[PDB]
């Protein structure tokens, strides 16, 4: 579609010394607005946002048997305590349980993963770097505009996957529910990288408000975990100034 | 499935002077508890809770084309200024827009409405009283045990309808979302009736918490719109009592 720059939105980045981009699209990706035309199409490691395509692929290949599959913890150390338990698919997405999705990816395997990222037009579609880590430290990259396009297809059930499996993943992604206000969303954080090679933090999703829908994707450069609150506050301020929130 | 009476729950009922029942079922043990086995099996006007089967039937028959159908307000006054606006299916359910569901019912028509309520085993299956009003002043009746059976089937996608259509109605029914706590629910209120033959107020739905699922159905006698808040107050206090929050 078309991407239109709104430089007034940089106010929210400038204040916090943040280098990043917000892409926000009403109704469709036919017309999106952004603070940074160039960065809106610049591609970055997806980190935990990749759990969305991975969940769809796991269901499509039958690796995830169905919506009520329980991912059992084997009792062995996992890198975060909140992952050391049995999880549903929703649970695994919402607590961002990487080892659940690593095992999903291993079972999907390289051939099938490559096939579905091509079907989904997902970023640079580059899965090299290890089947269980390409989206964590490999060569996979996707832009904020491309995240919006992917999530719009998911919203419309237009990905090349069953409608059932798109609906399953959508319910797992609900993060805020009010009578006329529904948010689907997913956070991501690649890590702190370095000073000269920063990590990336993401917030992607969509807002359904009355009869209208808004697709959004935010990323920022980050080299310190203490800046992570900005990954939600900057795009929240912008959507509020648009009267969305 | 089993059911057991827990007299202790009459606590929250006597306190605020209410005649009603709570049924709470843990999916993994296939075990339910209720304060009153007799009233758990008594059958009542479903009122707004019928919007759950009505929505599914509307989708199954194609009266509702799909999840992105907008129900346009025709500018004719409605009993609630909340309903005087375009609505998505989720919005119609969450705001409980009777006029939208009366029209759905009319388009489904008696023969098809009768068919699905039999397939769904929905209460006494008697839709006599007018195709657009059987569930609110007609003869249709359903018990709290029948509600949790029906909702358990919906959760499991085991109703005799498309998986897709069940998934659509399920997301429409989400009312609270946290990373490991997801609530689907629907309220109902038939009116004040008489103080001879009161009306009924419902709360039904289910809670997904970690990997457990709890199905619940509440109803109570109500003569005074005044006491509508206790429908949610009493089951919440019971569920809180059971560690479900
Ligand atoms: C996926 O990308 C990755 C996880 N994503 C993120 C993320 O926040 O996007 C984390 S952060 C990690 C999990 N919870 C801890 C935390 O500090 N969260 C935090 C701190 C301050 C603000 C916020 C917020 O407002 O969102 C969150 C540390 C994690 C790397 C994989 C591993 O799941
Ligand atoms: C459906 O049965 C019927 C509506 N159901 C409800 C209901 O509350 O179950 C009503 S009540 C009507 C709408 N909003 C007003 C109200 O007072 N709501 C209220 C009051 C106290 C507590 C709560 C709560 O915690 O949810 C809500 C009056 C309406 C009869 C219609 C949609 O078909
Ligand atoms: Mg990650
Ligand atoms: Mg650093």
SS in 3 state form for A158-220? CCCCCHHHHHHHHHHHEEEEECCEEEEEEEEECCCCCCCCCEEEEEEEEEEECCEEEEEEEEE
Distance A180 CA to ligand 3 centre (A): 31
**H-helix or E-strand spanning residue A227:** none
Of the candidates A167, A52, A58, the one whose C-alpha atom is nearest the C-alpha of residue B170 is A167
DSSP at A24: E
**H-helix or E-strand spanning residue A228:** none
Quick one: tokens of A185?
């969303």
Of A70, A177, A179, the CB nearest to B211: A70
Per the CB < 8 A criterion, the answer to whether A71 and A93 are in contact is no
Is A223 annotated among the ligand-binding residues? yes
DSSP at B231: H
Alpha-carbon distances of B80 from A93, B74, B76, B97, B99, rounded to whole Å: 38, 14, 11, 9, 10
The tokens 């579905």 sit on which residue? A116
- In chain A the domains, ranked by start, together with CATH numbers, are 1-245 (3.40.710.10)
DSSP at B243: T
C-alpha span between A20 and A216 (Å, rounded): 13
Of the candidates A12, A11, A19, A22, the one whose C-alpha atom is nearest the C-alpha of residue A200 is A19
What SS3 state is found at B232?
A: helix
Quick one: tokens of B110?
């008696």
DSSP conformation letters of B35-60: S-HHHHH-EE--GGGGHHHHHHHHHH
Task: Count the neighbouring beta carbons within 10 Å of the beta carbon of residue B115.
Answer: 15
Question: What's the angle, vertex CA B55, arms to CA B53 and CA B58, rounded to 5?
Answer: 105
Of the candidates A58, A138, A169, the one whose C-alpha atom is nearest the C-alpha of residue A103 is A58
DSSP at A93: H
What SS3 state is found at B213?
A: strand
Q: Where are the alpha helices (DSSP H) in chain A?
A: 10-16, 37-40, 51-60, 89-94, 98-119, 134-137, 144-155, 163-173, 230-241
Strands A212-222 and A20-26: antiparallel
Of the candidates B16, B73, B54, the one whose C-alpha atom is nearest the C-alpha of residue B224 is B16
Q: Do B180 and A67 touch (CB under 8 A)?
A: no
C-alpha span between B73 and B92 (Å, rounded): 11
What SS3 state is found at B2?
A: strand
First to last CA, chain B: 24
C-alpha span between A107 and B79 (Å, rounded): 55
Question: Is B86 in CB contact (< 8 Å) with chain A?
Answer: yes
Q: Say how many CA atoms lie within 13 Å of A68 toward its Cβ.
A: 12
* Helices and strands per DSSP (H, E), number in chain A: 9, 9
**H-helix or E-strand spanning residue B205:** strand B199-209
Quick one: tokens of B240?
């809180």
Distance A223 CA to ligand 4 centre (A): 4
Q: Say how many CA atoms lie within 13 Å of B30 toward its Cβ.
A: 3
Per the CB < 8 A criterion, the answer to whether A28 and A2 are in contact is no
What SS3 state is found at A234?
A: helix
Tell me the angle at which helices B51-60 and B144-155 cross, rounded to the nearest 10 degrees.
Answer: 40
What SS3 state is found at B225?
A: helix
Dihedral sign (CA B188, B167, A150, A224): positive
Quick one: tokens of A20?
């990043």
Sheet holding A181-189, edge to edge: A2-5, A31-34, A20-26, A212-222, A199-209, A181-189, A174-178
C-alpha span between A188 and A228 (Å, rounded): 10
Alpha-carbon distances of A71 from A83, A88, B92, B181, rounded to whole Å: 10, 6, 35, 17
DSSP conformation letters of B119-184: HTT-TT----S-TTTTTTTSS--EEHHHHHHHHHHHHTT-SSS-HHHHHHHHHHTEEEEETTEEEE
Distance A49 CA to ligand 4 centre (A): 21
Cα diameter, chain B: 50
Residues with C-beta less than 6 Å from any ligand 2 atom: B 47-48, 96, 98, 187-189, 201, 228-229, 232
Active-site position among A14, A27, A48, A241: A48
Dihedral sign (CA B94, B98, B104, B109): positive
Of the candidates B92, B95, B97, B96, the one whose C-alpha atom is nearest the C-alpha of residue B67 is B92
C-alpha span between A111 and B188 (Å, rounded): 51
Dihedral sign (CA A31, A37, A42, A45): negative
Quick one: tokens of A84?
């050391």
Of A94, A156, A175, the CB nearest to B180: A94
CB within 8 Å of B52: residues ≥ 6 apart: B93, B150, B151, B154, B169, B173, B186, B204
C-alpha span between A150 and A155 (Å, rounded): 9
Resolution in A: 1.9
Backbone angles phi, psi at A150, to 5 degrees: -60, -45
C-alpha span between B34 and B22 (Å, rounded): 5
Quick one: tokens of B77?
């006054």
Strand partners, B32: B3, B25
Quick one: tokens of A168?
């399953």
DSSP conformation letters of B58-100: HHHTTSS--TT-EE---S---S-GGGSS-EEHHHHHHTT-HHH
What SS3 state is found at B3?
A: strand
Quick one: tokens of A145?
């505009």
Active-site position among B8, B27, B28, B48: B48
Of B94, B167, B179, the CB nearest to A180: B94
Per the CB < 8 A criterion, the answer to whether B97 and B176 are in contact is no
**H-helix or E-strand spanning residue B188:** strand B181-189
C-alpha span between A219 and A21 (Å, rounded): 6
Quick one: tokens of B90?
């989720």
Q: Say how many CA atoms lie within 13 Å of B16 toward its Cβ.
A: 18
Question: Is A47 in CB contact (< 8 Å) with chain B?
Answer: no
C-alpha span between B102 and B92 (Å, rounded): 11
Of the candidates B188, B170, B97, the one whose C-alpha atom is nearest the C-alpha of residue A182 is B170
Q: Does B48 qualify as catalytic in the annotation? A: yes
Strand partners, A63: none
Experimental approach taken: X-ray
Per the CB < 8 A criterion, the answer to whether A204 and A147 are in contact is yes
Quick one: tokens of B33?
């508890």
Task: Count the neighbouring beta carbons within 10 Å of the beta carbon of residue A15.
Answer: 11
């Amino acid at each position: 579609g078309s991407i239109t720059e709104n430089t007034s939105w940089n106010k929210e980045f400038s204040a916090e010394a943040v280098n990043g981009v917000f892409v926000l699209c009403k109704s469709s990706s036919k017309s999106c607005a952004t603070n940074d035309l160039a960065r809106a199409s610049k591609e970055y490691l997806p980190a935990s946002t990749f759990k969305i395509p991975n969940a769809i692929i796991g269901l499509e290949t039958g690796v995830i048997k169905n919506e009520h599959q329980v991912f059992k913890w084997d009792g062995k150390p996992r890198a975060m305590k909140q992952w050391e338990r049995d999880l549903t698919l929703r649970g695994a997405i919402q607590v961002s349980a990487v080892p659940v999705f690593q095992q999903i990816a291993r079972e999907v395997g390289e051939v099938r993963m490559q096939k579905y990222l091509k079907k989904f037009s997902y970023g640079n579609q580059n899965i090299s770097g290890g089947i269980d880590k390409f989206w964590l430290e490999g060569q996979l990259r996707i832009s904020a505009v491309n995240q919006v396009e992917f999530l719009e297809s998911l919203y419309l059930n237009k990905l090349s996957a069953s409608k059932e499996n798109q609906l399953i993943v959508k319910e797992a992604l609900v993060t805020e529910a009010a009578p006329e206000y529904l948010v689907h969303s997913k956070t991501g954080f690649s890590g702190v990288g370095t000073e000269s090679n920063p990590g990336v933090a993401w917030w992607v999703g969509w807002v359904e408000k009355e009869t209208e829908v808004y697709f959004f994707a935010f990323n920022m450069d980050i080299d310190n975990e203490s800046k992570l609150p900005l990954r939600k506050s900057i795009p929240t301020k912008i959507m509020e100034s648009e009267g969305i929130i």
